[PDB]
């Protein structure tokens, strides 16, 4: 069965979608794909509709498209965005170009929320718990989100949260400097920056320049020690520290005052500069600060996820074909 599409003009191009989606309004676009909000008549909820108009423009684009689509279809967790539908007007791989992705819109983005309210510790607690609970599930699939931002955390009027929009102030140092092999603790850094902002209401490292951003960080966590410099591989990186004035690592208890001491403890553990010593999600969920909500039995992981495609070198139409397969094979959620 093929659904009936209709055509209107938005943002300003021609959007052709199935009729289940009504009352489309543009919510803004960019270097990624245009997005309209719509009302889903099947589920009676308001949804986000994303139109990919340059998915197969090249190998880089095409593989990216297949990568994201595989991942979204695989993500099923209470605290992570899930793929509600995927469709194309194209009737055959021959005429295949545009891909639309639809997702559930929870009440608001957290960047927007933190303006409109000062958050209680009871809010931050439950908020940080769910990021970790979803992050644990993301990392269990051998995935790195790489782009944790308040703009990427949806929250609703009951303070329930979901991680969405997978991949410049919240990003771990070891990436900006191309030091090393960047592991999953890069997302824990962002969680640490996010937790700080939630408590204090102000951005923790509002860097303007790349250097400025780095400066602001070191004045808090201090400059690398003898142990970490051995672990920076390239000499460009290792010598970019030197004649830059050293700052000591600071005491966070004195930086965040009035904050819950257990919260202060957990931030010490997340914002360590050396990725090897930085805490994990599974270890974070067991932290005392979450004593109230932590349940080892309700913190699930992900079904094994086959990434073998990442090793393949294929032509566009090959990636194009594979993504079309995944679009045809999509199983919509229930309920």
């Amino acid at each position: 069965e093929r659904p009936t599409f209709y055509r209107q003009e938005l943002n300003k191009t021609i959007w052709e979608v199935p009729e289940r989606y009504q009352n489309l309004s543009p919510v803004g676009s960019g270097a990624y794909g245009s997005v309209c909000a719509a009302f889903d008549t099947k589920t009676g909820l308001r949804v986000a509709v994303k139109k990919l108009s340059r998915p197969f423009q090249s190998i880089i684009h095409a593989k990216r498209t297949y990568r994201e689509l595989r991942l979204l279809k695989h993500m099923k967790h209470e605290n992570v965005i899930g793929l509600l539908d995927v469709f194309t007007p194209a009737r055959s791989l021959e005429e295949f170009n545009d891909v639309y992705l639809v997702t559930h819109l929870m009440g608001a983005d957290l960047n927007n929320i933190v303006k409109c309210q000062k958050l209680t510790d009871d809010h931050v607690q439950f908020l940080i718990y769910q990021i970790l609970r979803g992050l644990k599930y993301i990392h269990s699939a051998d995935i790195i989100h790489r782009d944790l931002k308040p703009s990427n955390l949806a929250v609703n009027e009951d303070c329930e949260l979901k991680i969405l929009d997978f991949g410049r102030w919240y990003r771990a140092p070891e990436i900006m400097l191309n030091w090393m092999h960047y592991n999953q603790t890069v997302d824990i850094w962002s969680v640490g920056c996010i937790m700080a902002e939630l408590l204090t209401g102000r951005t923790l490292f509002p860097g303007t320049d790349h250097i400025d951003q780095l400066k602001l960080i070191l004045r808090l966590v201090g400059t690398p020690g003898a142990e970490l410099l051995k672990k920076i591989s390239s000499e460009s990186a290792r010598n970019y520290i030197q004649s830059l004035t050293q700052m000591p690592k600071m005491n966070f208890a004195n930086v965040f005052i009035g904050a819950n001491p257990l919260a202060v403890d957990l931030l010490e553990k997340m914002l360590v500069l050396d990725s090897d010593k930085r805490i994990t999600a599974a270890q974070a969920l067991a932290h005392a600060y979450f004593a109230q909500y932590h349940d080892p039995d309700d913190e699930p992981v992900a079904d094994p996820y086959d990434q073998s495609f990442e090793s393949r070198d294929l032509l566009i139409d090959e990636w194009k074909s594979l993504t079309y397969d995944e679009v045809i094979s999509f199983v919509p959620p229930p309920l």
Binding site: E78, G107, C116, T120, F126, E157, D158, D295, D298
Partner: peptide
């Protein structure tokens, strides 16, 4: 109902 499943009373509501 993650709060429900953890036996936690409901937090102050967030607008919007």
């Amino acid at each position: 109902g993650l709060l429900e499943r953890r036996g936690v009373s409901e937090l102050p509501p967030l607008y919007i």
